[PDB]
Amino acid sequence: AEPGIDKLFGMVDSKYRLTVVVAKRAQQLLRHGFKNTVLEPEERPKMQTLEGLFDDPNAVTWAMKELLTGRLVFGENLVPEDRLQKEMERLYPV
Amino acid sequence: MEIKRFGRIREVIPLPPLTEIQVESYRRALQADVPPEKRENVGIQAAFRETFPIEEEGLVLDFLEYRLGEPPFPQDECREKDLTYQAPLYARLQLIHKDTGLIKEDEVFLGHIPLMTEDGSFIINGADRVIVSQIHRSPGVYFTPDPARPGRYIASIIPLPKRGPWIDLEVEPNGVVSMKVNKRKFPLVLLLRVLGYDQETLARELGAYGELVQGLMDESVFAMRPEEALIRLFTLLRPGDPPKRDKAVAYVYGLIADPRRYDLGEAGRYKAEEKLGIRLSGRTLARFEDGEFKDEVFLPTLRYLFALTAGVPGHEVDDIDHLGNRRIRTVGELMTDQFRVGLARLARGVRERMLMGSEDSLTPAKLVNSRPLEAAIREFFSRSQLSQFKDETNPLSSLRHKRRISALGPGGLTRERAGFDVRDVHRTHYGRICPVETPEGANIGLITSLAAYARVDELGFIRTPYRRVVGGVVTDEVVYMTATEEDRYTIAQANTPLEGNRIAAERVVARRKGEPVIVSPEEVEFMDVSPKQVFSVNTNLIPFLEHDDANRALMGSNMQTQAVPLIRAQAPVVMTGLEERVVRDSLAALYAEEDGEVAKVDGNRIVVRYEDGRLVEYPLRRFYRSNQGTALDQRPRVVVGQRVRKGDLLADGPASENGFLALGQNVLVAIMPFDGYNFEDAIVISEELLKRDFYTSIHIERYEIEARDTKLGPERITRDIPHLSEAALRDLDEEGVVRIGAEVKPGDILVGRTSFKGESEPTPEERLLRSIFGEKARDVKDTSLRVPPGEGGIVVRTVRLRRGDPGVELKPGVREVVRVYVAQKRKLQVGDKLANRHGNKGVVAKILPVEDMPHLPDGTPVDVILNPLGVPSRMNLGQILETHLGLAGYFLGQRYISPIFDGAKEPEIKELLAQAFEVYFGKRKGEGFGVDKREVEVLRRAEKLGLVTPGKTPEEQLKELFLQGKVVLYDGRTGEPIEGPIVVGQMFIMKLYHMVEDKMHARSTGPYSLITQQPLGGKAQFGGQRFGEMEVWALEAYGAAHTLQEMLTLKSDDIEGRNAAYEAIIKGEDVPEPSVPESFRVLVKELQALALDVQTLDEKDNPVDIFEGLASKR
Amino acid sequence: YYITQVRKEKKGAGLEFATPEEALAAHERGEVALNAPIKVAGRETSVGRLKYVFANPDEALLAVAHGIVDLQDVVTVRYMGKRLETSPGRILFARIVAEAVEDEKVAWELIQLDVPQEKNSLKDLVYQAFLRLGMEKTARLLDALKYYGFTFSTTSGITIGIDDAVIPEEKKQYLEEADRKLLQIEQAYEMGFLTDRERYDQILQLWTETTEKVTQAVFKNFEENYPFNPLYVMAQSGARGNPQQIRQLCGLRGLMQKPSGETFEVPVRSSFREGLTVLEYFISSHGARKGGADTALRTADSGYLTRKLVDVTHE
Amino acid sequence: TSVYIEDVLHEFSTIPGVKEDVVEIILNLKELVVRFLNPSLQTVTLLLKAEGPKEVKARDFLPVADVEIMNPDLHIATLEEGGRLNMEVRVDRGVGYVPAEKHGIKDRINAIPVDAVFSPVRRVAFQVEDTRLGQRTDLDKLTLRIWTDGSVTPLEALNQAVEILREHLTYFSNPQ
Amino acid sequence: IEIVVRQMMKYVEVTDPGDSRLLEGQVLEKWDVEALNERLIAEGKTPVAWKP
DNA sequence: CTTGACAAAAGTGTTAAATTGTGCTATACTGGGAGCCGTCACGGATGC
DNA sequence: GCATCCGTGAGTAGAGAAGCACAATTTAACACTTTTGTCAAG
Ligand SMILES: [Mg+2]
Ligand SMILES: [Mg+2]
């Protein structure tokens, strides 16, 4: 099972809202090259590679672990879509 | 290794030739060896005498005799050149000018008749084929009760299939009898008057039953003349046609009285006489002689129907599923029927050709066009449902295929019309059709197998042999007799005790019309020959069949066909006695024709010096690829100078060991769970099996390529393939073909071919690319043949056929064809399917090292670990008894023959186990070893489970466990014993044709469909997996909306989406939003082709263009 | 199930002593077995409960590793502050659940200790763990049960022999008794006391009762004489098999139906262990073919019904 | 590990004058037991040249220094009059079971890789009895039974097995 | 089962059109006629009479 | 970077063979041919 | 009311047999400039 899946299901009123939040956050992380993450450097997901221990490239894994921390705000009609995309690009250049 | 034989029943007669259903029937149809003047009126000889003579009405074309020439090519040549093994057919015909009185005779070439091989198969277009026998309702007269209304019966007259209309006689509620022809119901009184019957004749014959005759005495038409009554009937049958006497008589004669169009058949005529108690002169419902119609069958049919309705004791209804009412059409009859159809088409062409064009100067060669005859024959042997690709995985597979009985095919049945009655085991299948052998699924009860002792008679009815019993003594007189004749006698069981020939038991189990009864010896009239006659060949190869449930015995017999030949194949330790006969009758092995001495022995051929002195050389089939890809080779089993008797084995065939059928290996089996690797039918094997090459099979794959004529220039098969290095061309010879003996892997070139590129200007990016590098574009492109993914092996044969070669009939436009044979030696691996004869099947899920497998106290590890949980629900206890008998034979060094239902019982197995314990444990005592501490612990638990008697010595308790088939088994991982004794023995396990190597397939992107633009299907086409409706339902239930939309659009038929998705992924990007599927665009355009205006709208009902403006006219 | 089922002995069952030391003295001489039910003064106990009192599960399992006691022997173990009279295998099963969920107190409430673990009890444990702990902990518990279930089944000593299908001695008595009453029906039939259909119904009812009594005898024989019999253990635990299939292996095959649906008057009196006769095998072949034909046509009807249900409720 | 036969391209062929095909011959060669008398010897090539009619055995290989055939009576092929068998059999030294598809050793173009079972040990059984010493009667008597193909004596195999276990026990020395 | 049975009882038959454009015997969904009746009652017209 | 002029490449206008389309055969000839069959239940209409 | 014919539907995967004459249109072989493309010259 995914880590903290019970806690993930408990933070949303509909289980499909959790999937939407995770998937939308994952593409936000992919779009900005994981530079918009709310995870501390000791909290970043990692994978074991022969060369060494490196960052996890799976943004779905990152998105699920970010939601467990509680630093992400999700909901409907939070901010305008155009304003959200433009502002993230400015403060997280890519 | 001696063989111990069990059983008490003495079989008076041996098994009949197992392929005589194929071989004898086709010999009777061809009649190629009998001289023409002694040919009987059957087979294709009957076809000639039926269509001929052809009369113009004063030119007559008469048939005198026919002959079959020698085949143009041998069987091996036809297979290699993709030809049909056939014999030319010549008919000696004479043309008679009735006006002049002059006869001219010449022999015309009617075409080629395909020939049956010695084993009973055909080579059609270079491929081995088997004509499956067909079962259907026998022709004749039948009397079934009306289901809608009780107390009423209907008469059914059935001719040969496609040889006349089915006729129904029914007593209407009004009292008048009705005749239904071609879905047209009409009163039989009208037709009965046409055949010359008055009012007194009907009353004198049918007036002794009751009120039934009163409904057959309508005088409104009795006073009418037969001639106009014939015209009156002609109006009812086909209404509207102008009433003419000449046209009316032809239609009625052609319907019930024409032997050329109506044929009741030899079986149908015999059934009609037997049932109605009459004697038919021919095989038609009536005769047309002296310008008038005479009755043949209608009056006896109506007489029987009236008597049946009245309730006379001698009349009874007919069971249409009774095997006396069902007959078999063998290969000879099926070919003859299609030969007759082609001959009728040829006769019609002759008739239309002989009525115009140089009437005075005509010859039979000019009139006869044999193409319609050849077309019907070619169609039957190529595109018929009953003409099937020969199943030759192993010799037993081919033997079964020739004995298969199918209710489907042309003139038979379709699943929809096949209900629980044609699919069921009728009581008359006993001894004639195997009750258990049938394909589970949609074909259950529709495809069956002939019983081992059963044979099909001339009329097509299956007969089974019985021993005559008179005065209580069983004689050696064997009578082959049909189901309808079997119902007249009390037939005892083959297991009835006999003191010599006298029946010993006072109470005898017998059958009376299929019902089990207990009778006295003096009431017994016939006896079963053996228990083997009830079952087919495949079922007779299952030892301890009486201990297996029928559902699991079905699986075991079927999977024996799927077993692949092994390089070290072994005959089973426990046999039934038919292993030798299967090999002998399959013609896969080689035997000495008579007594002699072997002169030369080689892997390619054997030369034997017979007593008469003639030198006979037998070439050995070596590494031949079967239809299923299995390697079929014959290995010599004799030495130079060895004296051989008549029938002695010379060379073992595929899947045979010293003349005994060898479909698998004899391995040590432990019945115990193992760490979940036995979960749900999974099988654990030892690595020691791979070390000594058990379950290792040779498979050959064929790859073909053609060099074609093209409008841009001809394709060239050459080693000079542009834009490839020397490494890719390393294994190709100077001619462009891979060298023989080279190891090929996926992506390797088997043969190099260059095709001229289509004239098309390149994209500007490519043009700059070539401009930068200064490389001129060539005129040819790589179209070479490469190894498909997941395949490969060793190149063992290259076949190159070129245009103009003798016997090579290439298609037009093909200059040459190259065929490459690649052989791979397949070892047993994870995912390969193993099975035994008792229906226990499973895939190899784990291969363990030898030190990990459970082992005997003497250090012998087991080979296979089987889950005991597969036994109780499947109720197949024969594997357990085989394991117990195999354990005894493993230590006694002997094999066993236990016939089904009469063989080794537990007292006999346990006494063998007692002897096997004296070598199992007595050897240990001599070596100076007592009882293991670990064995003592197991015995302590064993007495707590009630498996051994308390108070006995450990040796005695170990013997008690051994008599139960259980031994103390040690765990190779820990060294500690298994806490309970484990059933360990030697069992025969087969390696099936379903292998994970040929079934694993994957695809990212590949070919797409032409119209729907969706991925193709199949591993051969590198296609995708079908995501059907139920799989779509699963994603809908999960709520996986985006996952579903990808499969619908991005991964199947969104042309823009799938191109963008692939490009996004290879750039490290996420796939874009999908678009409309191309299949929906196809649906809209197809709906528009149906004059339907289908338009997609938006929130405001405005039209939305999903075609990107490509279908909008300005 | 194998490690959670407790062994029952009969060497000294029902014998009474006066002091626990006297009961242990009898066990030393072999008069009474370790798990034979006895009474010390007025309480029903056994030698194992008194002889082996373990202070913790680790000590109890250490004795099992040293071979003093088996996992199925009933002993005294102090666990969760309670003096439990259970087997080390049942104590071992408790530790499996406790370590899988990483909570010793909750796992104690989730299991039924005093019963052998069968399909229903294990299903109840999984459902209860799901409610109290969620999917993630339930998945770990499922993997732990799978690991130990596979491990213990390998070393248990579970196999299938021909003698494992024990034929009860009551089958011969029932068959002879049925034969005697069968002659009574035939004698009454010849006397006119009953009609043809009455005779047919009487024979079927006679053999139906005889079939059911043999089924009871098969399982009663296993219950009292072979409690660890492989076929019995698989059926009781819910792993494989049902009482109908066990009877066909150890009792009698039973009545068979003709292709028309009518039942044959004579049943198949032999089981699969004894081996059917040629006629009995063919008689049983009608039902096997009919069942397979029913299965083939039912899948199409079931699949057609499912598509109708999907297409009416998809919205 | 590899065998080359003159005028033979692959293992799926037959040799004129030879009763057995190459697959059967390779199966016979897998039963050949070769003992290296030199511990430094790692690879040897055995040459066999025979002419029919004869039953060529393992003793018909040309003698090689520090190489001994432990089963000279092993049957390899049956030669018919007019048949010839010129083979080059390569024998390597290794451990475990290496299938021909893994090592793929071909000393020349037409050499046929052979699945290699390097283990000389044929069967091992160990036996435990109820021995007693003094007043204690729970003691163990261990008896090891070793069957080997003869290239390595059972005593040598036991000594190597003890050393392998002893070396593996030294792996528990330095914690990390 | 109740979800499927709910779909089996989704349609009704008009017995009396009242002041609507429907026809006697016309088959339509239960929700539609109830929604249609609400507008008819909201304006004083005769509601449609229907049977399940 | 302009000559410039120059040959190859390409376009183009005829003319031929080749391919393709069309008309026409005058004793008299005047209504076809193949199928034809072992399912079962269910609406729905169409009349009685 | 009822009886009858027609229409509908009946699991999923994978593997698998006229010439001939003549005109009319098209193709292909030529020639022809005419045109780009190119290597000397400044
Ligand atoms: Mg104590
Ligand atoms: Mg070796």
Coordinates of N, CA and C in Angstrom, one line a residue, chain B residues 561-663:
Chain B
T561 N -2.6 -35.3 -26.0 CA -2.4 -34.8 -27.4 C -1.4 -33.6 -27.5
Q562 N -1.4 -32.8 -26.4 CA -0.6 -31.6 -26.4 C 0.8 -31.8 -25.9
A563 N 1.2 -33.0 -25.6 CA 2.5 -33.3 -25.1 C 3.5 -33.2 -26.2
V564 N 4.6 -32.6 -26.0 CA 5.7 -32.4 -27.1 C 6.7 -33.5 -26.9
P565 N 7.3 -34.0 -28.1 CA 8.3 -35.0 -28.0 C 9.5 -34.5 -27.2
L566 N 10.2 -35.4 -26.5 CA 11.4 -35.0 -25.7 C 12.6 -35.8 -26.2
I567 N 13.8 -35.1 -26.1 CA 15.0 -35.8 -26.6 C 15.3 -37.0 -25.7
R568 N 14.8 -37.1 -24.5 CA 15.0 -38.2 -23.6 C 13.7 -38.8 -23.1
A569 N 12.7 -38.8 -24.0 CA 11.4 -39.2 -23.6 C 11.4 -40.7 -23.1
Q570 N 10.6 -40.9 -22.1 CA 10.5 -42.2 -21.4 C 9.1 -42.7 -21.4
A571 N 8.9 -44.0 -21.6 CA 7.6 -44.6 -21.4 C 7.2 -44.6 -20.0
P572 N 5.9 -44.4 -19.6 CA 5.5 -44.4 -18.2 C 5.8 -45.6 -17.5
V573 N 6.1 -45.5 -16.2 CA 6.3 -46.6 -15.3 C 5.0 -47.5 -15.2
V574 N 3.9 -46.8 -15.1 CA 2.6 -47.5 -15.0 C 1.9 -47.3 -16.4
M575 N 1.7 -48.4 -17.1 CA 1.1 -48.3 -18.4 C -0.2 -49.0 -18.4
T576 N -1.0 -48.9 -19.5 CA -2.2 -49.6 -19.7 C -2.2 -50.7 -20.7
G577 N -1.1 -50.8 -21.5 CA -1.0 -51.8 -22.5 C -1.2 -51.4 -23.9
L578 N -1.6 -50.2 -24.1 CA -1.8 -49.6 -25.5 C -0.7 -48.8 -26.0
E579 N 0.4 -48.6 -25.2 CA 1.5 -47.8 -25.6 C 2.2 -48.3 -26.9
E580 N 2.3 -49.6 -27.0 CA 3.0 -50.2 -28.2 C 2.1 -50.0 -29.4
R581 N 0.8 -50.3 -29.2 CA -0.1 -50.2 -30.4 C -0.3 -48.8 -30.9
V582 N -0.3 -47.8 -30.1 CA -0.4 -46.4 -30.6 C 0.8 -46.1 -31.5
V583 N 2.0 -46.4 -31.0 CA 3.2 -46.2 -31.8 C 3.2 -47.0 -33.1
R584 N 2.8 -48.3 -33.0 CA 2.7 -49.1 -34.2 C 1.7 -48.6 -35.3
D585 N 0.5 -48.2 -34.8 CA -0.5 -47.8 -35.7 C -0.4 -46.3 -36.2
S586 N 0.5 -45.5 -35.5 CA 0.7 -44.2 -36.0 C 1.7 -44.1 -37.1
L587 N 2.4 -45.1 -37.4 CA 3.4 -45.2 -38.5 C 4.5 -44.2 -38.3
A588 N 4.7 -43.7 -37.1 CA 5.8 -42.8 -36.8 C 7.1 -43.6 -36.6
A589 N 7.1 -44.8 -36.1 CA 8.2 -45.7 -36.0 C 8.4 -46.5 -37.2
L590 N 9.6 -47.3 -37.2 CA 9.9 -48.1 -38.3 C 10.1 -49.5 -37.8
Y591 N 9.5 -50.5 -38.6 CA 9.5 -51.9 -38.2 C 10.0 -52.7 -39.4
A592 N 10.5 -53.9 -39.1 CA 11.0 -54.8 -40.1 C 9.8 -55.4 -40.8
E593 N 9.9 -55.4 -42.2 CA 8.8 -56.0 -43.0 C 8.7 -57.5 -42.8
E594 N 9.9 -58.2 -42.7 CA 9.9 -59.6 -42.4 C 11.2 -59.9 -41.7
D595 N 11.5 -61.2 -41.4 CA 12.7 -61.6 -40.8 C 13.9 -61.3 -41.6
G596 N 15.0 -60.8 -41.0 CA 16.2 -60.5 -41.8 C 17.3 -60.0 -40.8
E597 N 18.4 -59.6 -41.4 CA 19.6 -59.1 -40.7 C 19.8 -57.6 -41.2
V598 N 20.1 -56.8 -40.2 CA 20.4 -55.4 -40.5 C 21.8 -55.3 -41.1
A599 N 21.9 -54.6 -42.2 CA 23.2 -54.5 -42.9 C 23.9 -53.2 -42.6
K600 N 23.2 -52.1 -42.7 CA 23.8 -50.8 -42.4 C 22.9 -50.0 -41.5
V601 N 23.5 -49.4 -40.4 CA 22.8 -48.6 -39.5 C 23.5 -47.2 -39.5
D602 N 22.7 -46.2 -39.6 CA 23.1 -44.8 -39.6 C 22.0 -43.9 -39.2
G603 N 22.4 -42.7 -38.7 CA 21.4 -41.7 -38.3 C 20.4 -41.3 -39.5
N604 N 20.8 -41.6 -40.7 CA 20.0 -41.1 -41.9 C 19.2 -42.3 -42.5
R605 N 19.7 -43.5 -42.4 CA 19.0 -44.6 -43.0 C 19.4 -45.9 -42.4
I606 N 18.5 -46.9 -42.6 CA 18.8 -48.3 -42.2 C 18.6 -49.3 -43.3
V607 N 19.5 -50.2 -43.5 CA 19.5 -51.2 -44.6 C 19.4 -52.6 -43.9
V608 N 18.4 -53.3 -44.3 CA 18.2 -54.7 -43.7 C 18.2 -55.7 -44.8
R609 N 19.0 -56.8 -44.6 CA 19.1 -57.9 -45.5 C 18.0 -58.9 -45.1
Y610 N 16.9 -58.9 -45.9 CA 15.8 -59.9 -45.6 C 16.2 -61.3 -46.0
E611 N 15.4 -62.2 -45.5 CA 15.7 -63.6 -45.8 C 15.6 -63.9 -47.3
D612 N 14.7 -63.4 -48.0 CA 14.5 -63.6 -49.4 C 15.7 -63.0 -50.2
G613 N 16.5 -62.1 -49.6 CA 17.7 -61.6 -50.2 C 17.7 -60.2 -50.7
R614 N 16.5 -59.6 -50.8 CA 16.4 -58.2 -51.3 C 16.9 -57.2 -50.3
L615 N 17.6 -56.2 -50.8 CA 18.1 -55.1 -50.0 C 17.0 -54.0 -49.9
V616 N 16.5 -53.7 -48.7 CA 15.5 -52.6 -48.5 C 16.1 -51.6 -47.7
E617 N 16.2 -50.3 -48.2 CA 16.8 -49.2 -47.5 C 15.6 -48.3 -47.0
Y618 N 15.7 -48.0 -45.7 CA 14.7 -47.2 -45.1 C 15.2 -45.8 -44.7
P619 N 15.0 -44.8 -45.5 CA 15.4 -43.4 -45.1 C 14.7 -43.0 -43.8
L620 N 15.5 -42.3 -42.9 CA 15.0 -42.0 -41.6 C 14.6 -40.5 -41.6
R621 N 13.4 -40.2 -41.2 CA 13.0 -38.8 -41.1 C 13.7 -38.1 -39.9
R622 N 14.5 -37.1 -40.2 CA 15.4 -36.5 -39.2 C 15.1 -35.0 -39.1
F623 N 14.8 -34.6 -37.9 CA 14.6 -33.2 -37.6 C 13.6 -32.5 -38.5
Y624 N 12.5 -33.2 -38.7 CA 11.4 -32.7 -39.6 C 10.5 -31.8 -38.7
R625 N 10.1 -30.7 -39.2 CA 9.2 -29.8 -38.5 C 7.8 -30.2 -38.8
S626 N 7.0 -30.4 -37.7 CA 5.6 -30.8 -37.8 C 4.8 -29.5 -38.0
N627 N 3.5 -29.7 -38.1 CA 2.6 -28.6 -38.3 C 2.6 -27.7 -37.1
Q628 N 2.9 -28.2 -35.9 CA 2.9 -27.4 -34.7 C 4.3 -26.9 -34.3
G629 N 5.3 -27.2 -35.2 CA 6.6 -26.7 -34.9 C 7.5 -27.7 -34.2
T630 N 6.9 -28.8 -33.7 CA 7.7 -29.8 -33.0 C 8.6 -30.6 -34.0
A631 N 9.8 -30.9 -33.5 CA 10.7 -31.7 -34.3 C 10.4 -33.2 -34.3
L632 N 10.1 -33.7 -35.5 CA 9.8 -35.1 -35.6 C 11.0 -35.9 -36.3
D633 N 11.7 -36.6 -35.5 CA 12.8 -37.4 -36.0 C 12.7 -38.8 -35.5
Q634 N 13.3 -39.7 -36.4 CA 13.4 -41.1 -36.1 C 14.8 -41.5 -35.8
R635 N 15.0 -42.2 -34.6 CA 16.3 -42.6 -34.2 C 16.5 -44.1 -34.3
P636 N 17.5 -44.6 -35.0 CA 17.7 -46.0 -35.2 C 17.9 -46.7 -33.8
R637 N 17.3 -47.9 -33.7 CA 17.3 -48.7 -32.5 C 17.9 -50.1 -32.7
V638 N 18.7 -50.3 -33.8 CA 19.3 -51.6 -34.1 C 20.7 -51.3 -34.4
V639 N 21.5 -52.4 -34.5 CA 22.9 -52.4 -34.8 C 23.2 -53.2 -36.0
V640 N 24.4 -53.0 -36.6 CA 24.8 -53.7 -37.8 C 25.0 -55.2 -37.5
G641 N 24.4 -56.1 -38.3 CA 24.5 -57.5 -38.0 C 23.5 -58.1 -37.1
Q642 N 22.6 -57.2 -36.5 CA 21.5 -57.7 -35.6 C 20.4 -58.4 -36.4
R643 N 20.0 -59.6 -35.9 CA 19.0 -60.3 -36.6 C 17.6 -59.8 -36.0
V644 N 16.7 -59.5 -36.9 CA 15.4 -59.0 -36.6 C 14.3 -59.9 -37.2
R645 N 13.3 -60.0 -36.4 CA 12.1 -60.8 -36.8 C 11.1 -59.9 -37.5
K646 N 10.0 -60.4 -38.0 CA 9.0 -59.7 -38.7 C 8.3 -58.8 -37.6
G647 N 8.1 -57.5 -37.9 CA 7.5 -56.6 -37.0 C 8.4 -56.0 -35.9
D648 N 9.7 -56.4 -35.9 CA 10.6 -55.9 -34.9 C 10.9 -54.5 -35.1
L649 N 11.1 -53.7 -34.0 CA 11.3 -52.3 -34.1 C 12.7 -52.0 -34.8
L650 N 12.8 -51.1 -35.7 CA 14.0 -50.7 -36.3 C 14.5 -49.3 -35.9
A651 N 13.5 -48.4 -35.8 CA 13.9 -47.0 -35.4 C 12.7 -46.4 -34.7
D652 N 12.9 -45.9 -33.5 CA 11.9 -45.2 -32.7 C 11.5 -43.9 -33.4
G653 N 10.2 -43.7 -33.4 CA 9.6 -42.4 -33.9 C 9.6 -41.4 -32.8
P654 N 9.0 -40.2 -33.2 CA 8.9 -39.1 -32.1 C 8.1 -39.6 -31.0
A655 N 8.5 -39.2 -29.8 CA 7.8 -39.5 -28.5 C 7.5 -41.0 -28.4
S656 N 8.6 -41.8 -28.6 CA 8.5 -43.2 -28.5 C 9.8 -43.8 -27.9
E657 N 9.7 -44.8 -27.0 CA 10.9 -45.4 -26.4 C 10.8 -46.9 -26.5
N658 N 11.6 -47.4 -27.4 CA 11.7 -48.9 -27.7 C 10.3 -49.4 -28.1
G659 N 9.6 -48.6 -29.0 CA 8.3 -49.0 -29.4 C 7.2 -48.6 -28.5
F660 N 7.4 -48.1 -27.4 CA 6.4 -47.7 -26.4 C 6.2 -46.2 -26.5
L661 N 4.9 -45.7 -26.4 CA 4.6 -44.3 -26.4 C 5.3 -43.6 -25.2
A662 N 6.0 -42.5 -25.5 CA 6.8 -41.8 -24.5 C 6.5 -40.3 -24.6
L663 N 5.4 -39.9 -24.0 CA 5.0 -38.5 -24.1 C 5.6 -37.6 -23.0

